[PDB]
Amino acid sequence: NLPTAQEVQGLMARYIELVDVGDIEAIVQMYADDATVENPFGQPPIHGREQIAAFYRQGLKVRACLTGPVRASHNGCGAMPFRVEMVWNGQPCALDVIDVMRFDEHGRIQTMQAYWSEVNLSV
Amino acid sequence: NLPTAQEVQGLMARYIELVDVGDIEAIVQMYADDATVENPFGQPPIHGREQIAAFYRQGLKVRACLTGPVRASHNGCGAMPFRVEMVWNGQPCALDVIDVMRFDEHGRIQTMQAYWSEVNLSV
Numbered sequence A, B: 001n002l003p004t005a006q007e008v009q010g011l012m013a014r015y016i017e018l019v020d021v022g023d024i025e026a027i028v029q030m031y032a033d034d035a036t037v038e039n040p041f042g043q044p045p046i047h048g049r050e051q052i053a054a055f056y057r058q059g060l061k062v063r064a065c066l067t068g069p070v071r072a073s074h075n076g077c078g079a080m081p082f083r084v085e086m087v088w089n090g091q092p093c094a095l096d097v098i099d100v101m102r103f104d105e106h107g108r109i110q111t112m113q114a115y116w117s118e119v120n121l122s123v
Helices: A005-021 A024-030 A048-059 B005-021 B024-030 B048-059
Strands: A031-038 A063-066 A077-088 A091-103 A109-115 B031-038 B063-066 B077-088 B091-103 B109-115
Touching (some): A005 A024, A005 A063, A005 A091, A024 A031, A024 A048, A031 A048, A077 B109, A109 B077, B005 B024, B005 B063, B005 B077, B024 B031, B024 B048, B031 B048
Parallel strands (some): B031 B109
Antiparallel strands (some): A077 A091, A091 A109, B063 B077, B077 B091
């Protein structure tokens, strides 16, 4: 059901583990079927698992690690800071991001907002 | 005006500096006159500078430190992770928090959501 705060901490940590290994189908399964993603926040959202899978397939050697604890609420939401390390035109880079997620009553991500901009990239 | 991503980084960093010294009047001035604060996110919002002042006066020796970079967007919003250290019944404790802010056209905080729960407290 709709995650408690402990359950949100666990779900968001699992998300980062899935991004880190790059398991696109497992990441997509964490989302509700009609979830929305705004990544970076400020951009038009993407809707549904097909579009979300496309987004992660395009983005995802990548590593992702939490860079602080998950902050969870008592209403099925949480926020976390992390860093993604990737290769862009042969150049290692890193991006610092904070995601905010809202989970539904089945423990699936209903909405995701990713906060970052070019200021958060390190080449 | 409405802050660029660089300006959001600067404003949110300034907010932490003001919380760290405990300058309640300077903090309240960062908010729009009719701003809303949800802290912790999940609790009913408070509205307006008078209630926001009361909130900070009650919450605020306290220290506050960013524990990673500000993540700013291009639509006048940002998110940041930080830690607040305080004394509760003579016991030092720390709270890990992520705040999301939305700034208005004058560079004032229109809405603040603070993410954390008891899971983020260390006594």
